[PDB]
Each structure stands twice: as structure tokens, then as C-alpha cells.
Design a protein around this ligand. Structure first.
Ligand SMILES: *[C@@H]1O[C@H](CO)[C@@H](O[C@@H]2O[C@H](CO)[C@@H](O[C@@H]3O[C@H](CO[C@H]4O[C@H](CO)[C@@H](O)[C@H](O)[C@@H]4O)[C@@H](O)[C@H](O)[C@@H]3O)[C@H](O)[C@H]2NC(C)=O)[C@H](O)[C@H]1NC(C)=O
Ligand SMILES: *[C@@H]1O[C@H](CO)[C@@H](O[C@@H]2O[C@H](CO)[C@@H](O[C@@H]3O[C@H](CO)[C@@H](O)[C@H](O)[C@@H]3O)[C@H](O)[C@H]2NC(C)=O)[C@H](O)[C@H]1NC(C)=O
Ligand SMILES: *[C@@H]1O[C@H](CO)[C@@H](O[C@@H]2O[C@H](CO)[C@@H](O[C@@H]3O[C@H](CO)[C@@H](O)[C@H](O)[C@@H]3O)[C@H](O)[C@H]2NC(C)=O)[C@H](O)[C@H]1NC(C)=O
Ligand SMILES: *[C@@H]1O[C@H](CO)[C@@H](O[C@@H]2O[C@H](CO)[C@@H](O)[C@H](O)[C@H]2NC(C)=O)[C@H](O)[C@H]1NC(C)=O
Ligand SMILES: *[C@@H]1O[C@H](CO)[C@@H](O[C@@H]2O[C@H](CO)[C@@H](O)[C@H](O)[C@H]2NC(C)=O)[C@H](O)[C@H]1NC(C)=O
Ligand SMILES: *[C@@H]1O[C@H](CO)[C@@H](O[C@@H]2O[C@H](CO)[C@@H](O)[C@H](O)[C@H]2NC(C)=O)[C@H](O)[C@H]1NC(C)=O
Ligand SMILES: *[C@@H]1O[C@H](CO)[C@@H](O[C@@H]2O[C@H](CO)[C@@H](O)[C@H](O)[C@@H]2O)[C@H](O)[C@H]1NC(C)=O
Ligand code: NAG
Ligand code: NAG
Ligand code: NAG
Ligand code: NAG
Ligand code: NAG
Ligand code: NAG
Ligand code: NAG
Ligand code: NAG
Ligand code: NAG
Ligand code: NAG
Ligand code: NAG
Ligand code: NAG
Ligand code: NAG
Ligand code: NAG
Ligand code: NAG
Lengths: 125, 98, 121, 437, 124, 121, 52
């Protein structure tokens, strides 16, 4: 469906086209256009590396879809599985959990740190 | 060195007939049309490539050392001096006559 | 557009010196060599020689060495160029039409030529 | 078998590409202070069984180097004094010397001073080439064509080597093969961290300093049947050229305005002689013997290859132009380029004029005034090559004539970057293997 | 052998030396300054594009990596016995410079299918 | 939440809990500022490339097969993990770093070729 | 071209060759009216139906 083609698609149908959005994240004074475009390119590289570091900190490095041990708090969203993956889109869902994103990110970081510690102790003995 | 050999100085061809003036040469060859003492005009640049603004009838083909300068649907205006040039060397051109 | 305007016809005595001029305008003159050709009446073209517009260096055959002289003058404002050909020791063989041709590429594919200055001794 | 795709990263493969190389080298115009300090041990890896299709005449390294040298020249000339008040009427008397002709003019002129409302009266020994008449009234040659700025005083023009290193993800392939003409497949290829020591030496008709070939004299032309293409000759043995300006010169500071200084040739403390360059006679004769041998290789064994002095042009092209100790020499090489070769401690002194107003890189509108250099100056350089042009219209009648070349200054860089190519690594590769997840 | 030393060596011989090529892929006040900055940004972007291409196929952080995509014979009709002994990587790139895009797309689709299957398997 | 570099003076046992805090702050963000940002990005990529070359990609705490040479440090596990901070230990293995890095590179190389031999039976 | 300084020129009108006329612009009348008609029809949506 091309770049951002599954925007109006449901969450489940848009989870099959994560690659087409992943590729377009990195596809791209002496003069008026020089320094500002170079700054934009450096900012794009920094944003991509921040996203990759965030993925690696949660243990989901190199994975487009990755599972985690963090339980889903009912306060974050009371909606069930069917009305999330067959009714709503990704835009609406991001608008819904826009407050709760930071708490979820912190829980993912804490869970991965705990998992790494448990794995290290288990491998030690 | 440069060796040049051209077709005989005068060929007579009627309107609607196709004539080929062969020129055997070593080097990049260009075809020019000189019209009655006026300055030459570049018909063909390199072996087979057409100058911009030249009529589409004009064409050439290179095989071995010979360049034929195929002209399709000859007309009364095209009747003029034609010659082949490689670098600084120019043969005395042929002359279509009608 | 691209244009190379020549001068009028000249008549000179034998042993005198003739100058033919060629004002080039309408393009980046400094990038393309300006060759000089000499058509005798009824015979084929001859190669008087080329001149670089950037450095002024000419190149002429052994036949024209010592007599011909190709100079170039870039008029201020960089609006036009003037390429001059001077013949010094004229004789009966120099009755001819002189053309100034722009060598576009390494094929020596002269696409623009001058009007042609006819000189007769 | 039913093999599957296997992905390899770090594959040693490359493709042709153009990128911006950065300078590394171990004050002057070519700012090496803002360059990478080069590593002491160059990494040269001989790539065996690799043949690479080199083409020196379409090298982008040469174009990038030319652009960089021009930009560095402009950058060095920018942040210091511009000599705009000098273009006025100059009443120029002849110099005191009892006599080449009028090679030095005395030229007294009213000039500006620190106070705008006041005018002084100074003088400055200009050269004949730097002044054109307008019986005694003169003016600087640059006045009706260009805006002149002073070459910047503490800054030196002495070349020092600069290495053109490719960035990460790119490699430089050197062609170690000897007797290697510019185009075609080089079979002996090496990968290097950076180029050799390349001194930017501006010169016409004679490539000074630089590299010195390996085995034999090498003639390289973009097309040897084309007159418009220059012929670069590289020697296997250098020819020592000893150049000198013998006049002892005095530099006077003049105040043209607040904080601006103009340096003038106040006096000649000594004797007025003509500058020159000596070339050894026997060495140059043997060198030209090697050159005519390698040219007869190209043009057949029965051609009367003769050399002749340059046909007309600007002064930068008709004479061997260069810079020695800050003073710009223009040497009449009519004695060098002579003789007529047939199919078989004495020195040649070339009288060099000297100029102060200079138009570099084939430009007008940006004129440069080299300040006078105090004391006598001497240089010892290596002629390691030539630029030549062949007279056209041979009509297969032998007797090919070769005159010295022009001031393109990209041919000067092509005699150093002929062996180098820039390639881009493409580490991702896909192959078939019985590998399967 | 140094950087790019195994360019002439056989493919199997260069499989063990991939690391040195992999390492050497990262490394206006002045004319050198802004140009060096642009060159560094270009090198960083190229390296990250290569790493992203590796990671989208499931080969993240590995020089050698199997994939589930079958080697379709239309891309090359050749025998594995003599590719790894009597061929060099440059020639191999020259043969298959023309089908890289579709192969990369197939790798993307196959890894997306594999990740979906792993998600479904871990669901139950 | 001790914060950035908060566990720098605590022993390693409490310092290894806060690896993410110092890892996050390596990517927080004229010509000089652009050069600084590019250098920071290149340094982060150098560190991550070093991690990926040892097989520790995307792993803050990574176990490896390299044996610990006794010549590098004669101390014991309890003394290392419960008496000194990370700064003192870094001062204590300053000259042995490159050898350990090379051994990790060689060990991961051996691991990947062994894995390829095993999977392609 | 008037040389004002070294390497600097000032391009200045020298002479009008021919009759001195006035610059102008022509717009079709039959087009510009009913173009204004469409504009008025679309403005009356915002500003009311009986407005002048
Ligand atoms: C080809 O390379 C040759 C060397 O292989 C070049 O010859 C050398 O060139 C320099 C040119 O000046 C000369 O070496 C010294 O010159 C200085 C004068 O410059 C210094 O002083 C001024 C102010 O006093 C300062 O601004 C400069 O930065 C320098 O520090 C004198 O101090 C010395 O007497 C000495 O002569 C040599 O003549 C020469 N060196 C040799 C023969 O060893 C040659 O110029 C190059 N060819 C070119 C560029 O065409
Ligand atoms: C210089 O320009 C000349 C043309 O003026 C180029 O010469 C061309 O060279 C090629 C390669 O040798 C010739 O083609 C080959 O030779 C024969 C036919 O002569 C035949 O076996 C093949 O067709 C083959 O391509 C070509 O004929 C010749 N002429 C032209 C007009 O293209 C030359 O390559 C240029 N370069 C140099 C570095 O000399
Ligand atoms: C290349 O070499 C030739 C021959 O050596 C040089 O030609 C010579 O040029 C000078 C300077 O223009 C001529 O002198 C002039 O001659 C007449 C008197 O005969 C007079 O008008 C001038 O006062 C001046 O002295 C000289 O005659 C001439 N020689 C010959 C044999 O023609 C030429 O200058 C050199 N070109 C270069 C280095 O570019
Ligand atoms: C150039 O001319 C000036 C005068 O215009 C000369 O300077 C004078 O030289 C005489 C004779 O030695 C002294 O008496 C004067 O005091 C000098 N200075 C003046 C008038 O300011 C100068 O010597 C000449 N320079 C040369 C020929 O190199
Ligand atoms: C060039 O001229 C200068 C003066 O303009 C000479 O420098 C003088 O040298 C003598 C002898 O050593 C000293 O006593 C003077 O004090 C110097 N004068 C100045 C003003 O510095 C210099 O020696 C001359 N050079 C040559 C090669 O003759
Ligand atoms: C370059 O040098 C040659 C050789 O010295 C000069 O040719 C001489 O010119 C003078 C007049 O300037 C004549 O009197 C000589 O007879 C010439 N010598 C010959 C023909 O061998 C030539 O003029 C110089 N070029 C310049 C100064 O531009
Ligand atoms: C250029 O100047 C050299 C010195 O800088 C000259 O070298 C000479 O060579 C011998 C020793 O080899 C001695 O005679 C003398 O002391 C001097 O060093 C060289 O000949 C000279 N070259 C030319 C062409 O004039
Ligand atoms: C848009 O939504 C409708 C249902 O409202 C669905 O049938 C259709 O396929 C969707 N179109 C997309 C995702 O392009
Ligand atoms: C934040 O959550 C509240 C309810 O707790 C909700 O009303 C609000 O819409 C959320 N914010 C956004 C930006 O959607
Ligand atoms: C400047 O004047 C000199 C004086 O001789 C002349 O040669 C030159 O052509 C002039 N330059 C121009 C008009 O650009
Ligand atoms: C001054 O000018 C020239 C300079 O070459 C010289 O030949 C001439 O004799 C001098 N003129 C005089 C003293 O009148
Ligand atoms: C300086 O200006 C004066 C007038 O004040 C004039 O007579 C003279 O010729 C000018 N030049 C010099 C060099 O004195
Ligand atoms: C020199 O170049 C010519 C063509 O320009 C070619 O025939 C010749 O083989 C080249 N030299 C080599 C490969 O050594
Ligand atoms: C030196 O040149 C002379 C003629 O000028 C000739 O006799 C001699 O052979 C030349 N030397 C060489 C090495 O060619
Ligand atoms: C060049 O050589 C000729 C003889 O061939 C000689 O007469 C002439 O003087 C020489 N020119 C010089 C040395 O400038
Ligand atoms: C000339 O070349 C020689 C080697 O042939 C070298 O030692 C010397 O430094 C070079 N430079 C000179 C004499 O300036
Ligand atoms: C290719 O070079 C490698 C070393 O780089 C060597 O092992 C191999 O034998 C060479 N090829 C041939 C055919 O000798
Ligand atoms: C693809 O590229 C190759 C190599 O350049 C070319 O020869 C071929 O015609 C192209 N097409 C196919 C279908 O292989
Ligand atoms: C500092 O030292 C005390 C000593 O009792 C220890 O308890 C504490 O954990 C150390 N570190 C910090 C970060 O406070
Ligand atoms: C490493 O060795 C140097 C001497 O080369 C020594 O000064 C330094 O303290 C040592 N570092 C350690 C043991 O961490
Ligand atoms: C404008 O000029 C064009 C020709 O260029 C003409 O056809 C058209 O009718 C003119 N329009 C006017 C006068 O409104
Ligand atoms: C403009 O067109 C409208 C609508 O056709 C018409 O009512 C009106 O009279 C026209 N105005 C003129 C011709 O001035």
C-alpha cells in the first residue's frame, strides 16, 4: 500500500506493513539550503538513533513486533482485544494512550532491567 | 594518422530517391551540408547521432570504417554540397545535382 | 541565442596584411574552442587553426605557421568576444572565405559557424 | 539442494562513486592547520587478482582538488587589505639604471592617507608588465578589468604536501603498475588510507616538483590524435632548474588608510640585473631524447619530431609561469623548447620577467597584488614533466611539432592524481547457501 | 590481511575476514570543515541505512545470517561447488546487480511473516 | 531514581542497576554545535558497533565466553563487586582494555563461524 | 555600460530607439466580467443573498 498507506486501516491490518514505514524513516552557510538541511539530516539521524536506543533498552532490538512481560493495566484502556485490533486505527489508539505513554515506557525499561538481572543470576549459577 | 576517402564528387538523384554517400575514415566523423557558398551546417555529430533542429530524414550508420549517411525522401531543398569531417581534415565534398 | 557575426569582405594588395574579425556572443564563450576554417573558391575546406578563448593559445598547421595569427579580445562587462585572424604575407592562394566555427565537444562537432569573410588579393 | 538466501555484511566489493575527500597533512594559503594530522604509518594493502578500469581524464578527484585550491586561495585573500585607491594616474620616470629597456618604472603618485581630507605623495617601483600607458602618465594594468586586492603579507605561497583522504565507507585505489597510461585496466591495484604527498604547485609549460615516475618517461593524453587535448609528459629523472631574482629589493610601508598598509618596492639596494632560470644543457638534452623516444613510440618510427617555443597568448601561457619565494616569474623558454630530432657544465639561461599583479585560475575581476620580497631570492626545483600541444594538419607528412602547454591548472593536478581512483564500498551481499534458520 | 585485503581472495576466504571491512565503515569556517562534516553525515547515514537493512531482514548484529527466502533459480543458474572456490565477490555483484530490489523486498516480507508467526505462537 | 551519574560513587552492586540512566543520556541531543552533535552521534555509533562486534548488541549486561586472565587483576569477585566503585576499577584496568576488546572480537568471530558450521550441516 | 570603478559597471538606459510609448497590460473584458461574476456568486454565499 506504499508509505503510510495503512494509516486509515485498522491496527491489525497496519501491523502487516510496519516495514514500509520503517524504510522511509531514514531515506534522506555556503548556500541557503546547505546548513539548515544538514541540521535537519543530523536531527533525523538523532531521532532514529533515539528510537533505536529506546527499542534496545526494552530488549526489543532488531524486532518490528516484540513481546514483553509488562502487564496491561486496565486503567490505561478498558477496551477489549476485538474492539482494538478490528475497530480502531493506530492514530486513534495513539490519541487514546497519549498521557500513559511515559509510564508504559518506564515500566518496559524497568522490566527489561529486571529480566537482564534475572538472566545474569541464572546464567551465573 | 588520419586517412579519409569519399564517394565520387557528383551523384545525380531525383526527388523521392534515397542516396548514400559513403566516407571511410579513422576517427570521429561528422557530416556537414554546405549550401552554395554559405557556411556549413552540422547534420550529423559523431557516427550516428542527430543534431537538434535537423530534419528527421537525415540519418547515418557506422559499421567498420564506413559511414553511409542514409537520407530518406530527398527534396529540392536538400540538394547541396555534403562532406565528411574528422578533426581538422575535410575532403572536397560531393555535390548532389538536380 | 548563439551567434558569431563576421566582418565585411576585404580587398588587400599582395604582400599586405589582412585582418578578419568574428564577434561571438550568446553563450559561455570561454568553454568552447573557436576554430578558423578557410574555404577556397570551389575547393574543399582547409584548417587555419583553433584558438582557446580562456588562454589565447592558437594552434595552426606547418603551412600557416609564421603568417597567420589568431588573437582573442574579451570586451569588458564580459558581454562579447572578438576573435581576430591576421594574415601577414598574403599571396594569390589566399583568395578565400574565412569561417569561425564553435567546437562544442571532443568530436569537433562544429554546430555554429560565422557568415564568412571573403578576402581577395 | 534447494539453497536459500544468505546475507553477508562486510563484503569486499565496491562501485564507482564521487565523494568529497578531506585533507590530511603532517600561515600559508593552503590552510593545513585546519586539516587532520595524518597518521605516521600509511596503510597500503596490495589487492591481488584485482584489475580496475582507471580513467584519469574524467577523474572527479581532479575537479574537487581544483575547486578546493581555488576556494582556499579566495579564503586566504579575503580577510586583509584591498588596494582600491592605487588605480590612479601614475607619473612614471625611467629607473636610474644606464641602459631590459624599461622593465622597472619609478612611478610617483598622490595617494590617500589616514585622514580622508589629506593626500600624500609617494612612489613605488612598479614593473613594466604591471603598468600600461594612458608620455609619462601610466596606470595599473588591472584598472579597467578587475578589482585588485593585496596578497596577504604574513601568508606564504610555498607549497607543502596535502593528502586527499576519502571518508568512511569509501576507498582509494592506487595503481601501482608501472608503464601505466592514464586509461584502461590497471592489473596492479592497492587500497590506501590516503594519497601520497601532493604539493599544489601552480605552473605552466613545465610541471615543477611533484612525483617522478617509476621506470620510463610517460606520455599521457586524453586522445593523442586530438590537438585540443594537451599531452602530459612525466620524466623518470628530474631536471634541476635554478631560478633567481638577483635584485635586492626594499619594502616600504605606506598608510593608504586607517589600519591598511600597502607594500611598495621603495628602492633597489644593489645592481639592476635580469632575473632568470638556469637549466643544465646536457641533462635537458638527454631528457628531451627520452621524450622524443616515447613520442616516436606513439607517432611512428619515421617522424621528424621537433619542438618549438609557444605560440602567442596571455603572458601566463606563452612563458613558464610559476611562483618562487612569493615573486611570480614568467620565464621565456625559447631556449628550452627548440631543436629538431630526426630518426637516427654549460647552462641554458631563461630570461624571466616578474609580475606583481596576477590573475589566477583563469579569472578576471579578482586581481591580486603580490607584495615585494625583500632581498635576493633563489629557488631550486625539479622539472619532472611537461605540458605540450601538437600542431594540427599533419596530413600524414611527418614533422610533428610540439609546443609547450597552457594554464588550465587541472592538467597540473592530473599529473598527481592519475593513479588514484575513489570507490564506494557496498558491504551488503546476498548469496545462495544451504544455511537456513 | 588488512582492510579490503580479501577482495581478490575467494568468497570462503573472505567470510572469515568480513570483520575488518565492517569496522572500516564508520571511522564555513574553513573549506575543509563543512565538507568534512557533510562527508561524516553521509558516512553515518550510509552505515545506518545498511544496519537498518540488516535489521529489517532479521540479521541484526550478525555478519552472516540465514534467511527463509528460497534462492529462486531465475536470479542465477549456478552451482554452489565452484562459487565459493573459483569466484570473487565483485564478479558476483556484477551478475546480480539487477535483482537486488526484489530480493530485498522478499526478505522484508518473509521476516514480517516470520515475526507475525512468532507473535501468534507466543500468544498461546 | 538516583538520576544521571548518581550511582557513580556507590559500589558496583548498586551501580549496575542504573545502567539505563547513563545509557539514555548519551543521545540527549552554528558549525561548532553541528560538529559536536555529529561527533556525539559518531561516538555512540562507535560504542554500539563495538558492542555488536562482540555479539552484545542491544544488551546492557552481556555475558561472553572470554576467560578472565588473572594477570589483568589479581583481586577476587567480592572485593571487585563490593569494595570499589566503577571509577577505581576503570583506573585499575586502563592499560588492559585493548587486549580484552580484541579477545572479545576474536571469541565472537569463532562463535559465529561455529554457528554457521552447525546450522549448515 | 558606465565604468564606475575597477571591474565595476553601471548599466544605464542610453536611448529609446523609436517612439516613446507607455507600458501597459491588456485583460480580456468578456473574460474578466463573468470571472467577477463567479467571484460575486461565491462571495454571496458568505455575505448573504440580497447583498450588493
Ligand atoms: C619545489 O620544491 C622546492 C623544495 O624541494 C622549493 O625550493 C625551496 O623553496 C623555498 C622558497 O622560499 C626556499 O627555502 C627557504 O626560503 C626561505 C624564505 O622563506 C622563509 O622566510 C619568509 C620570511 O623570511 C617566511 O614568510 C616563509 O614562510 C619562510 O619561512 C629562507 O629562509 C631560506 O633561505 C630558504 O632558502 C628554498 O629556496 C628552496 N629550498 C631548498 C632548495 O632546499 C621550490 O620553491 C619548489 N618550486 C616551486 C614552488 O615552483
Ligand atoms: C580517441 O578518439 C578515437 C576516435 O577518434 C577513439 O578511437 C576508437 O577506438 C576504439 C577502441 O579501439 C575503436 O573501436 C574498436 O576497433 C574496431 C573498429 O576500428 C572494431 O574491432 C571494434 O568496433 C572496436 O570498437 C574505434 O573504431 C575508434 N574510433 C571511433 C570513431 O570510435 C579512441 O577510443 C579515443 N580514445 C583514445 C584514448 O585514444
Ligand atoms: C618564439 O620564438 C620566436 C623566434 O625566436 C620569437 O619571435 C621573435 O619575437 C620578437 C619579439 O616580438 C621579435 O622581435 C621584434 O622584431 C621586430 C624587428 O624585427 C620589431 O618589431 C620589434 O622591436 C621586436 O624586436 C623577433 O623578430 C621574432 N623573431 C622571429 C625570428 O620572428 C617569439 O617571440 C617567441 N614566442 C614566444 C616565446 O611566445
Ligand atoms: C624614484 O624617484 C624618486 C623621486 O621621485 C627618487 O627619490 C629621490 O632621490 C634623490 C636622489 O637620490 C634624493 O635626493 C631625493 O631625496 C629622493 N626622494 C624624494 C624626492 O622623495 C628615487 O631615488 C627614485 N628611485 C629609483 C630610481 O629607484
Ligand atoms: C640587501 O640590502 C639590505 C639593505 O637594504 C642589506 O642588509 C644590510 O646588510 C648589512 C651587511 O650585513 C648590514 O650591516 C645592514 O644593517 C643591513 N641593512 C638592513 C636595512 O637590514 C642586505 O645585506 C642586502 N642583501 C644582499 C644579498 O646584498
Ligand atoms: C624569448 O627568447 C627568444 C630567444 O632569445 C627571443 O627571440 C629574440 O628576440 C630578439 C628581440 O626581442 C631578437 O633580437 C633575437 O634575434 C631573437 N632571437 C632568436 C630569434 O633566436 C624572443 O623575443 C623572446 N620572447 C619574448 C621576450 O617574448
Ligand atoms: C643548481 O644549484 C646547485 C646547488 O644548489 C648546483 O649544484 C652544484 O653541484 C656540485 C656538487 O654536486 C658543485 O659543483 C656545486 O657546489 C653545487 O652544489 C647545481 O649544479 C645547479 N644547477 C644548475 C642547472 O645550474
Ligand atoms: C475503510 O473502512 C471501511 C469500513 O468503514 C473498510 O471496508 C475499508 O476497507 C477501509 N478502507 C481502507 C482500509 O483502505
Ligand atoms: C488524558 O486522559 C484523560 C482522562 O484521564 C482524557 O480525558 C484525555 O483525553 C487524555 N489526553 C489526551 C491528550 O487524549
Ligand atoms: C584595458 O585597457 C588596455 C589598455 O591597453 C587594453 O589592452 C584592454 O583591452 C582593456 N581591457 C578591457 C576593455 O577589458
Ligand atoms: C625612458 O624610456 C625608455 C624605457 O625603455 C628608454 O628607452 C628611453 O630612452 C627613456 N627616454 C628618455 C630618457 O627620454
Ligand atoms: C599630485 O597632485 C598634484 C596637485 O595637488 C598634481 O599637480 C600632481 O601632478 C599629482 N601627482 C604627483 C605625483 O605629485
Ligand atoms: C594505453 O591505452 C591504449 C588506448 O588508449 C591501449 O591500447 C593500451 O593497451 C594502453 N596501455 C596499457 C593497458 O598498458
Ligand atoms: C644532444 O643533442 C645533440 C644535438 O643538439 C645530439 O647530437 C645528441 O645526440 C643529443 N643527446 C641525446 C642524449 O639525445
Ligand atoms: C634555437 O635553435 C636554432 C637552431 O636550430 C638557433 O639558431 C636559435 O638561436 C635557437 N634559439 C634559442 C636558443 O633561443
Ligand atoms: C628533486 O628530486 C630529488 C629526487 O630526485 C629530491 O631528493 C629533491 O628533494 C627534489 N627537490 C629539489 C632539488 O628541490
Ligand atoms: C588471489 O589472491 C589471493 C590472495 O589475495 C590468493 O590466495 C589467490 O591464490 C589469488 N588467485 C590466484 C588465481 O592465484
Ligand atoms: C539486468 O542486468 C544485467 C547486467 O547488467 C543485464 O545484462 C540484463 O539485461 C538485465 N536484465 C536481466 C533480465 O537480467
Ligand atoms: C556512599 O557511601 C555510603 C557509605 O555508607 C554508602 O552507603 C552509599 O551507598 C554510597 N553511595 C551513594 C551513592 O550514596
Ligand atoms: C598500565 O601501565 C602503565 C605503564 O605503562 C601504568 O602507569 C598504569 O598505571 C597501568 N594501569 C593500570 C595497572 O591500570
Ligand atoms: C493576449 O495575447 C494573446 C497572444 O499572445 C492573444 O491570443 C490573446 O487574445 C490576448 N489576450 C487579451 C488581449 O486579453
Ligand atoms: C457581466 O456578466 C454578467 C453575467 O453574465 C452580466 O449580468 C453583466 O451585465 C456583465 N457586465 C458587463 C457586460 O459589464
Amino acid at each position: 500500500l506504499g508509505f503510510l498507506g495503512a494509516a486509515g486501516s485498522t491496527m491489525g491490518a497496519a501491523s502487516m506493513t510496519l516495514t514500509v514505514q520503517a524504510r522511509n524513516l531514514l531515506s534522506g552557510p555556503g548556500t541557503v539550503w546547505g546548513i539548515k538541511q544538514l541540521q535537519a539530516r543530523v536531527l533525523a539521524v538523532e531521532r532514529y538513533l533515539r528510537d533505536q536506543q529506546l527499542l534496545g533498552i526494552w530488549g526489543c532490538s532488531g524486532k518490528l513486533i516484540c513481546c514483553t512481560n509488562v502487564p496491561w493495566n486496565s486503567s490505561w484502556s478498558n477496551r477489549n482485544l476485538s474492539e482494538i485490533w478490528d475497530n480502531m486505527t493506530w492514530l486513534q489508539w495513539d490519541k487514546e494512550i497519549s498521557n500513559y505513554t511515559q509510564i508504559i515506557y518506564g515500566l518496559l525499561e524497568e522490566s527489561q532491567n529486571q529480566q537482564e538481572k534475572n538472566e545474569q543470576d541464572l546464567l551465573a549459577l | 594518422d588520419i586517412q579519409m576517402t569519399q564517394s565520387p564528387s557528383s551523384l545525380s538523384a531525383s526527388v523521392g530517391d534515397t542516396v548514400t554517400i559513403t566516407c571511410q575514415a579513422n576517427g570521429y566523423l561528422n557530416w556537414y551540408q554546405q549550401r552554395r557558398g554559405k557556411a556549413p551546417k552540422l547534420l550529423i555529430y559523431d557516427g550516428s547521432k542527430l543534431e537538434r533542429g535537423v530534419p528527421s530524414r537525415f540519418s547515418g550508420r557506422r559499421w567498420g570504417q564506413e559511414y553511409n549517411l542514409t537520407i530518406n525522401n530527398l527534396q529540392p531543398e536538400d540538394i547541396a554540397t555534403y562532406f565528411c569531417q574528422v578533426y581538422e581534415f575535410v575532403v572536397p565534398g560531393t555535390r548532389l545535382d538536380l | 541565442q548563439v551567434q558569431l557575426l563576421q566582418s565585411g569582405a576585404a580587398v588587400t594588395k599582395p604582400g599586405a596584411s589582412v585582418r578578419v574579425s568574428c564577434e561571438a556572443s550568446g553563450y559561455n564563450i570561454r568553454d568552447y574552442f573557436i576554430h578558423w576554417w578557410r574555404q577556397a573558391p570551389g575547393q574543399g575546406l582547409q584548417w587555419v587553426g583553433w584558438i582557446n578563448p580562456k588562454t589565447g593559445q592558437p594552434n595552426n598547421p606547418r603551412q600557416f605557421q609564421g603568417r597567420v595569427s589568431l588573437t582573442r579580445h574579451a570586451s569588458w562587462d564580459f558581454d562579447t568576444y572578438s576573435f581576430y585572424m591576421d594574415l601577414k604575407a598574403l599571396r594569390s592562394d589566399d583568395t578565400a572565405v574565412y569561417f569561425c566555427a564553435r567546437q562544442r565537444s571532443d568530436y569537433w562537432d562544429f554546430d555554429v559557424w560565422g557568415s564568412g569573410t571573403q578576402v581577395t588579393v | 539442494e534447494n539453497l536459500w538466501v544468505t546475507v553477508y555484511y562486510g563484503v569486499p566489493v565496491w562501485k564507482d562513486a564521487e565523494t568529497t575527500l578531506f585533507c590530511a597533512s603532517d600561515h600559508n594559503v593552503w590552510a593545513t592547520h585546519a586539516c587532520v594530522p595524518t597518521d605516521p604509518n600509511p596503510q597500503e594493502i596490495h589487492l591481488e587478482n584485482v584489475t580496475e578500469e582507471f580513467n584519469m581524464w574524467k577523474n572527479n578527484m581532479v575537479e574537487q582538488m581544483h575547486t578546493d585550491i581555488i576556494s582556499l586561495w579566495d579564503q586566504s585573500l579575503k580577510p586583509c587589505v584591498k588596494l582600491t585607491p592605487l588605480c590612479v594616474t601614475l607619473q612614471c620616470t625611467n629607473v636610474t639604471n644606464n641602459i631590459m629597456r624599461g622593465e622597472l618604472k619609478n612611478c610617483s603618485f598622490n595617494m590617500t592617507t589616514e585622514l580622508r581630507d589629506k593626500k600624500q605623495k609617494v612612489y613605488s617601483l612598479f614593473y613594466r608588465l604591471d603598468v600600461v600607458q594612458i608620455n609619462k602618465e601610466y596606470r595599473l594594468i588591472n584598472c579597467n578589468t578587475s578589482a585588485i586586492t593585496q596578497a596577504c603579507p604574513k601568508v606564504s605561497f610555498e607549497p607543502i604536501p596535502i593528502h586527499y583522504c576519502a571518508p568512511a565507507g569509501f576507498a582509494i585505489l592506487k595503481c601501482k603498475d608501472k608503464k601505466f597510461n592514464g586509461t584502461g585496466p590497471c592489473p596492479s591495484v592497492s587500497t590506501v588510507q590516503c594519497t601520497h604527498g601532493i604539493k599544489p604547485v601552480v605552473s605552466t609549460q613545465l610541471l615543477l616538483n611533484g612525483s617522478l615516475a617509476e621506470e620510463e618517461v610517460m606520455i599521457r593524453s586524453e586522445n593523442i590524435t586530438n590537438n585540443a587535448k594537451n599531452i602530459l609528459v612525466q620524466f623518470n629523472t628530474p631536471v634541476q632548474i635554478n631560478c633567481t631574482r638577483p635584485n635586492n629589493n626594499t619594502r616600504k610601508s605606506i598608510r593608504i588608510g586607517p589600519g591598511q598598509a600597502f607594500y611598495a618596492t621603495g628602492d633597489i639596494i644593489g645592481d639592476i640585473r635580469q632575473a632568470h632560470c638556469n637549466v643544465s644543457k646536457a641533462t635537458w638534452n638527454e631528457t628531451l631524447g627520452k621524450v622524443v623516444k616515447q613520442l616516436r613510440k606513439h607517432f611512428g618510427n619515421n617522424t621528424i619530431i621537433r619542438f618549438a617555443n609557444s605560440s602567442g597568448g596571455d603572458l601566463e601561457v606563452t612563458t613558464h609561469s610559476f611562483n618562487c619565494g612569493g615573486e611570480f616569474f614568467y620565464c621565456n623558454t625559447s631556449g628550452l623548447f627548440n631543436s629538431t630530432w630526426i630518426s637516427n657544465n654549460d647552462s641554458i639561461t631563461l630570461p624571466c620577467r616578474i609580475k606583481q599583479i596576477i590573475n589566477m585560475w583563469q579569472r578576471i575581476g579578482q586581481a591580486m597584488y603580490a607584495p615585494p620580497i625583500q632581498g635576493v631570492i633563489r629557488c631550486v626545483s625539479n622539472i619532472t614533466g611537461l605540458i605540450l600541444t601538437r600542431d594540427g594538419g599533419s596530413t600524414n607528412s611527418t614533422t610533428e611539432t610540439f609546443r609547450p602547454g597552457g594554464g588550465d591548472m587541472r592538467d597540473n593536478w592530473r599529473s598527481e592524481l592519475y593513479k588514484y581512483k575513489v570507490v564506494k564500498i557496498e558491504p551488503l551481499g546476498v548469496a545462495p547457501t544451504r544455511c537456513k534458520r
